[PDB]
Design a protein around this ligand. Structure first.
Ligand code: 17M
Ligand code: 17M
Lengths: 238, 9, 235, 8
């Protein structure tokens, strides 16, 4: 596979080029929020972003080397984590706010519109502030987002656990993160310390995803919003 | 399965 | 402080010395399991282990520096992850089985004794297999368990001190790998491999918490006051 | 909470 042959510079370039666009909400900015309409806006946005995510994933070096069945599992596992890390990245320069879309920038008080959502907002905001205090770089962000894609469902390939290829690609992204930090002038010690700091945030992103999934399921089970067939299938996977 | 279809197209 | 002046060797010694005891189950092996008896044994074990967990936490360098309230929050967040990493470690050399206690070693299929439990067993077993694959060392394990305690709840809060201590544990892990003869590239790769497993442990804890809450509601068995409070902290 | 007392 050419992915394992890529240099670190080439891996980063590949990742950066695969980046999906920043989509807009269909928020009608002169009409009032309800729990239902806010949930509608957020899930409508997620649905459109999902199409772009699928096409992004195909461009993550080594992903199309995987079987189609494995590709499905990884995306089913990680989709909300991936949406969330994107959100937290977008929201970095907006302290106290979540930039779901350029035309949908919400504070925690607006989060209270939807029952159970403010707790999730608070976790996202805390992650964004952590990214901000760490001065997360875009090149680091794309590595982290790819790690989530490859890692989150890699230990549920069962009923004995099976995938060396995925792990080799993950190892390559580790090499790339270290390369990035070395090139940025971090000392050898700072390199391993920052590597751990960034990977530990992925534990928090998993937590948020788990909580968000239970939240979304709750909204669907209360008939608050109709979810797209895609979103229903992605949600059903959990 | 929609995901399956999108991944092929 | 004091944890911040510890050497890597001293950090390892400290964490090894702080290890809690391996408890036994009250399991009577002459009687077949029921859903009720199985959950009973498992939750009784968890309750007893929790008491020793508190003692261990107090011995994790840096933990005692935090306010009582911060200590409470970290343990409330991390307790099931901590029990689970313990279980996965104990079960390493028992492929296909989960060594809850030396006298309670359960096969995958015994997970089906309890509604919804086999899926959680499958995740735990997969984690144990991964540890086995990686030849996880005892010294690495105690570092990882301490990282879980300090990291899991740190973002739902003091914080700078926790991050300084976390950095020292990372330093410790790298030190162990260097001592083991790993190249720089191998050290970084292995550090990442280990830390990514913590994402899966978090996932398992969240699923486990949902399962335990459902078993509480079904009222299969009664949970202890402590367990009930530790469970209620997540909702 | 019981955890509170145990820590003490
Ligand atoms: C799932 C979620 C609504 C939508 C949503 C969430 C989180 C991050 C998102 C990031 C995006 O780029 C798009 C949508 C996101 C919410 C978590 C909880 C719930 C149901 O409100
Ligand atoms: C929470 C749990 C029952 C008990 C349990 C679990 C997992 C790991 C444990 C490790 C221990 O050292 C002691 C108990 C454990 C189970 C997860 C789900 C449930 C309710 O069966």
């Amino acid at each position: 596979s050419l992915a394992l042959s890529l240099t670190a510079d080439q891996m980063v370039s590949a990742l950066l080029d695969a980046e999906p666009p920043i989509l807009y909400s269909e928020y009608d900015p002169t009409r009032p929020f309800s729990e239902a309409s806010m949930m509608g806006l957020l899930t409508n946005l997620a649905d459109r972003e999902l199409v772009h995510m699928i096409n992004w994933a195909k461009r993550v070096p080594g992903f199309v080397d995987l079987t189609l069945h494995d590709q499905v599992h990884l995306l089913e596992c990680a989709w909300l984590e991936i949406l969330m890390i994107g959100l937290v990245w977008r929201s970095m320069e907006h302290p106290g706010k979540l930039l779901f879309a350029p035309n949908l920038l919400l504070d925690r008080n607006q989060g209270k519109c939807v029952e159970g959502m403010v707790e999730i907002f608070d976790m996202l905001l805390a992650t964004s502030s952590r990214f901000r205090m760490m001065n997360l770089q875009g090149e680091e962000f794309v590595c982290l987002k790819s790690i989530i894609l490859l890692n989150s469902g890699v230990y549920t390939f069962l009923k004995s656990l099976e995938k060396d290829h995925i792990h080799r690609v993950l190892d390559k992204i580790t090499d790339t993160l270290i390369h990035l930090m070395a090139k940025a002038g971090l000392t050898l010690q700072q390199q391993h310390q920052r590597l751990a700091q960034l990977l530990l945030i992925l534990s928090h992103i998993r937590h948020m995803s788990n909580k968000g999934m239970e939240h979304l399921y709750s909204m669907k089970c209360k008939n608050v919003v109709p979810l797209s067939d895609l979103l229903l299938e992605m949600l059903d996977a959990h | 399965k929609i995901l399956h279809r999108l991944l092929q197209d």
